[PDB]
């Protein structure tokens with residue numbers, strides 16, 4: 204059923220107050236450093252012995268980005284193999300890429316994103332989400348985003364692999380949808 208990242212996002216949707224969102228937003232430059240009881244509560248109900256500074260950064264970052272959203276797709280998320288890829292940020296980014304005439308600068312910004320280390324990531328992701336949110340119609344699956352960020356430092360780099368494949372798979376798909 205409901206994975207922990209799903210549960211997390213549901214909880215933010217159901218329980219956040221406007222004050223929480225203000226804090227979540229404010230913490231964007233140093234996620235975790237701006238404490239939000241709501242989030243702390245959720246992390247304090249699992250973490251145990253994973254002083255995982257990463258986890259805390261990822262949760263808080265997703266909170267902040269989510270708390271910043273403007274997408275029409277989030278207005279829907281209040282009512283409600285291939286599925287794998289569409290649900291990843293790679294797919295969202297490709298959609299943005301195609302919306303802007305297959306713009307090489309998005310592709311580059313995207314490659315740069317896949318190169319990020321832990322320190323670079325919160326910043327580059329924040330810029331990309333921002334770009335994505337400029338297009339009205341593109342959904343970002345937050346729970347998948349969080350799961351993916353959590354696994355960023357895995358060894359043969361599966362998330363980054365996964366994203367890349369989603370991106371080029373979507374682009375290719377469009378070159379077929381057109382005839």
Ligand SMILES: [Hg+2]
Nearest residue numbers: 260261264352
């Ligand atoms: Hg992160």
Ligand SMILES: [Hg+2]
Nearest residue numbers: 212344345346
């Ligand atoms: Hg979601």
